[PDB]
Structure formats: C-alpha cells, structure tokens
Amino acid sequence: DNSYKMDYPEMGLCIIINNKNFHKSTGMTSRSGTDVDAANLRETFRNLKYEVRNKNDLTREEIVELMRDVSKEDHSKRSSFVCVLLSHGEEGIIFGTNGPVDLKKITNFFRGDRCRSLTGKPKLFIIQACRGTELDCGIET
Amino acid sequence: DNSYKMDYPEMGLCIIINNKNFHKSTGMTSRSGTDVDAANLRETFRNLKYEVRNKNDLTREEIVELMRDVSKEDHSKRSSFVCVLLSHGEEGIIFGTNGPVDLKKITNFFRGDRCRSLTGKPKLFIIQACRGTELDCGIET
Amino acid sequence: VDRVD
Amino acid sequence: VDRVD
Amino acid sequence: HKIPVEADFLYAYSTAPGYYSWRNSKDGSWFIQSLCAMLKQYADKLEFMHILTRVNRKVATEFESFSFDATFHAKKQIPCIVSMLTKELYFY
Amino acid sequence: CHKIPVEADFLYAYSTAPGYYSWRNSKDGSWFIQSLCAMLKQYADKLEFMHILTRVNRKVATEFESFSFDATFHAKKQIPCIVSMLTKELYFYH
C-alpha cells in the first residue's frame, strides 16, 4: 500500500484550462506563449494515457461550471485526476477571462467527501499563474 | 547531481523551538504534550547525527534573535539545516510566548543570499502549529 | 486528551 | 520576450 | 550561474493550509509522533519526500480526534509537504 | 469506522513560490510548463512523481533567468513549489 493503484482501466481525465485573452475590464495582458504550453501539455499527458480535454478562454463562471461537471462524472474506472490551470493569478487565486476565482473553490469540488469516485485516488493540480508580485533576485553560486 | 551532498563533516544543526507556556495577554492555551514531541525529536535527530539545540518558551523577540544568530554561524562544514517549530500558529504565523511572528521573517534569515554557507544546501523547516481554524470532517473509507 | 494548536 | 503571469 | 534565493527550502507543515493541527496531551502531536516514527523506520531506506509521504498516510489514517464538543469530535488531519528542493535528500 | 481527511490525496504543483511572480516567455511558453513536460517525457517511466517534480524544480532554478530592459524585472529567477497532501507514491509506469 506504498503506491497508488494505477492499473484501473483508465488513467483518468486531464483537464487543461488555457486562458490567453482577458476582458478589458480585468486590465490583464494577453498571455503570449500559453498556446505552446497547452499543446505541449496535451501531447505529454496523452502519452501518459490520460483522456485529455483542452479548454480555452473560460470565464470564471465557466471554469466553476466545468470543474463541477467534471467532479460529478463517474471516475470509478479511473486511476487519477489531473487539472492544469494556465492563467494570470494572485496568491490563492486564478483568473477567468473576466476576473478572479479562488483556487479553493475549484479544488473543493474534488474533496474526498464531494467526489466519491476519486476518494483515495491522487488529484493533481498543476498551476501556471502568478502568486503575488515578488521577484527573486537570485544568488550567484 | 541528483542528490544533495550529505557527506560534509557534519550533518548540520537541528534547532528545536518548543513553546509550551504562553503569556496571559495572548489568551493562548498551554500546549500539553509538546514536551513529548521535543524529546522525541531530540532522540530522532540525534540518531541522524544532527547537532540538536533545544530551546523552550521563547518570546517572539527571542525567536528572531536566535534565528538571526544561527544564520550568522559558519555552516561551511555542515550538509544541511533543520529547524523545528512547536507552538500555536495561524496561516503564515508562529507564536512566541508573547505573541505572533511571521514565519517568513524567520525563514528569510536563511535565504540563499543571506546565509551564504547554506547556499545550495537543504534547509528544512518542520512546523507543528495551527494554520487557521478549519476542521476536517473526513470521509468514510 | 486531544487539543488543537 | 519574458513576461510575468 | 545563479539560483533562486528561495530554492532548497522544504517546509514540512503539520496540517493543510487554513486548518487546525491536533496534539494529544500524553502522546504528543499527531504529526511529530508520525514524523519521528517514520524517520526511525525509514531514514536508512527512503528519500525524504517518500518518508514524508508515509507520514502523510500515517497521520491521515491512524488519528481521529475525541471531544465532548461535537464541533471538535471525530476530526481528521492531513499534513502538507511544501518543497522548493532541487535535489533528492537521503540521510544515509 | 475508518475515515481519511477530505483534503488528503491532493498534489498542487505550483509554478512559483508563494508571493512571487511566475515567468513566461512569449514564444517558448512558461518556464515551468516547458520544464514539466520535458521531465515527464524523460522520466515518467523511471521516477516517482515527486522526484520528477524535484527535477523540474532544479531545471527551472538553474536554466532560466529573465531579461528585461526594466532593471526592476531584469535577471530574475524562479523556483516552483510542490505542495503534497498525497498519502502514497505515484508512478505513471507499472
């Protein structure tokens, strides 16, 4: 019992949310280069045998709707779950195209008591987004 | 190149800050059982050949002064650094006996550019403290 | 007894 | 160009 | 050649962000109890992140709070490993 | 009679440390996602997932440094941040 059971019939879903273009009301820049990320991720996780779903330019309402729908699917035959979020962010927050949503609102759908067919199975969230405005000056070694 | 070099002459320091009794002004409960933790950690890190230094009931000013002083030591002959904090806490915060201090203030002393003799070496912070007031109801297996 | 930190 | 997210 | 000033830190938190952490007055805290048990068992056999994963499983499966207050009774805990490490860490 | 925490078995692979910006190249993609895909391609049949992510940390930390004509943003570095509430080892291979 040292490693997760990964020989279920299916590896699981990989959901890639790729937000590139933002509403003018957000004051957020277009995220050039994110399509390269999204395509690299799709190929990578397909090769890992995931069922990959790419989504582009979702509002925060659409992100929440998508994540809730995914969490209410039957994952009984799936080993794991992967969600990749590519967007602007702040600490604890990712941006829909029309504004911020708390990361906790997204991940809460997959809590052990709310997504019963994923209880006991690894739930991976990969987050490319800022977490604030600090910069790391580095140190020469 | 894949593993940290751990064959320096010394494994390194293990600083254990064990706060059990708090000033009346904080309203904080006495932390019965923390002495069991501190003794357990002392023996465990002794067997790993760390130079353990146990400190008990430190004010926040004494915590900061200790961390500053430890970060000014010459760690050149040491493989790593370990600090264990046992206290009350909130998200991002550890309690001295007389009040809270930001964890970031403690860990910043060991940043790669401010503790040069620990640059490139693993710096481990082990934190037994609350991070808020949420309770996990769990889900039946 | 069980207590929170 | 390098940009921040 | 530079490295980030935040690199090579590991934060082994007793509990998830936002949550209480539990301590027993006689046995010690759930997390430190479990951390010391796993280091004793595995420090000459496992990389540190795999030791901490065993700590996670031990805290998650072997402890559940007892309280006369229903608000605090039958509660659970998962620790939280936060790694900015750039290499594997073996104590042997 | 047995429960697990509702927060157990999550892994959050963040591109950057708490409080920090995260860097993205306008043509090559983000430093973190570039590195994550490279290490999964190279190591997913060889290494446990946390060890793959540790190689991602090292790749981002060592191989990338920003360029900016604005001195405020120039020559900056990044370390990703692995946050594990997993209770078991994760291998993509059997």
Q: What is the 3-state secondary structure (H, E, C) of chain A?
A: CCECCCCCCEEEEEEEEECCCCCHHHCCCCCCCHHHHHHHHHHHHHHCCCEEEEEECCCHHHHHHHHHHHHCCCCCCEEEEEEEEECCEECCEEEECCEEEEHHHHHHHHCCCCCHHHCCCCEEEEEECCCCCECECCEEC
- Count CB neighbours of B74 within 10 A: 8
Q: Which residues of F touch E87 (CB under 8 A)?
A: 54, 58
Residue A130 φ/ψ region, left for φ over 0, alpha for ψ in the -120 to 50 degree band, beta for the rest: beta
Interface mutation target, options F82, F90, F91, chain E, most CBs of E under 10 Å: F82
E22-24 sheet: strands from edge to edge = C2-4, E22-24, E28-29
DSSP state letter for F10: E
Residues in chain A closer than 8 A to B141 (CB atoms): 119-120
Beta-carbon contacts of residue A102 (< 8 Å; ≥ 6 apart) = A92, A93
Please report all neighbours of A, defined by 3+ CB atom pairs within 8 A: B, D, E, F
Q: Is A137 on the interface with E (CB under 8 A)?
A: yes
Give yes or no: A75 in active site.
no
* Extents of the domains making up chain E: 1-92
Show the tokens assigned to B109.
């002393």
Q: Of B53, B48, B43, give the one whose Cα is nearest residue B14.
A: B53
- For residue B141, what are its two tokens? 């297996």
Query: Within an 8 Å CB–CB cutoff, is residue E66 touching chain B?
Result: no
Residue E16 backbone dihedrals phi, psi, to 5 degrees = -70, 155
Nearest residue of chain F to residue E82 (CA atoms): F83
The identity of residue E26, as a single letter, is: K
Of F81, F82, F89, the CB nearest to E50: F89
* Partners of residue F11 on adjacent β-strands: A124, F84
Strands of F29-30's sheet in order across: D2-4, F23-25, F29-30
Task: Tell me how far CA of residue A41 lies from CA of A83, B26, B132, E80, F33, in angstroms.
Answer: 11, 49, 35, 26, 8
Q: Does residue B104 sit at the A interface (CB-CB below 8 Å)?
A: no
- The rounded distance, in Å, linking the Cα atoms of B53 and B59 is 17
Structure tokens at B10: 């010394």
Q: How far apart are CA A127 and CA B1, in angstroms?
A: 27
Tokens encoding E3: 């490295």
Select from F2, F5, F55 the Cβ nearest to the Cβ of B136: F5
Helices (H) and strands (E) in chain B, counts: 3, 8
Q: F23, F35, F57, F78: best mutation site toward chain E, by most E Cβ within 10 Å?
A: F57
Resolution of the experimental model in angstroms, please? 1.8
What is the rounded distance in angstroms from the CA atom of residue F34 to the CA atom of residue A41?
A: 9
Handedness of CA B130, B136, B138, C2 (dihedral sign): positive
Distance, CA of E38 to chain centre: 10
At residue E72's C-alpha, the angle toward residues E67 and E77, to 5°, is 105
Q: Do E13 and B135 touch (CB under 8 A)?
A: no
Query: What is d(CA F59, CA F38) in angstroms, rounded to the nearest whole number?
Result: 10
Helix (H, G, I), strand (E, B) or coil at E28: strand
- F80 burial type by CB count under 10 A (0-12 exposed, 13-18 middle, 19+ buried): buried
Give E5's contacts in chain A (Cβ within 8 Å).
Answer: 136-139
Contact between F78 and F60 under an 8 Å Cβ cutoff? The reply is: yes
B23-30, Cβ contacts within 8 angstroms, sequence gap of 24 or more: B23/B97, B23/B98, B23/B99, B25/B98, B25/B99, B26/B88, B26/B95, B26/B97, B26/B98, B26/B99, B28/B88, B28/B95, B29/B88, B29/C3
Instruction: Burial-class residue A27 by CB neighbours within 10 Å (0-12, 13-18, 19+).
Output: exposed
Separation of alpha carbons A73 and A52, rounded Å: 15
Please identify among residues 45-74 of chain B the ones whose CB lies closer than 8 Å to any CB of chain E: 47-48
3-state secondary structure of B15: strand
Partner residue opposite A119 with nearest CB, options B119, B137, B139: B139
Q: What are the beta bridge partners of residue A86? A: A18, A128
Which structure tokens are listed for F28? Answer: 């090559």
Beta bridge partners of A14: A52, A82
Cβ proximity of B106 and B94 under 8 Å: yes
**A119 is written with which tokens?**
């209880």
Q: What is d(CA B38, CA B85) in angstroms, rounded to the nearest whole number? A: 10
- Which residues of chain C neighbour B129 with C-beta distances below 8 Å? 5
DSSP string over B17-60: EE-----GGGTPPP-TTHHHHHHHHHHHHHHTT-EEEEEES--H
Taking CA atoms, what residue in A is nearest to E60? Answer: A120
Pairing, β E22-24 against β E28-29? antiparallel
Question: Active site includes A83?
Answer: no
* The amino acid at B108: N
Residue F19 CA: distances (Å) to CA of A72, A79, A96, A136: 33, 33, 20, 10
Tell me the residue type at E73. H
- Structure method: X-ray
Contact assessment for residue A88 and residue A19, using Cβ atoms and an 8 Å cutoff: yes
Contact yes or no for B19/B97 (Cβ under 8 A): yes
Q: Please give the Cα distance from B83 to B69 (Å, whole number).
A: 13
Residue F73 and residue D2: Cα distance in Å, rounded? 9
Tell me the chain B residues in contact with residue C1 when contact means C-beta distances shorter than 8 Å: 32
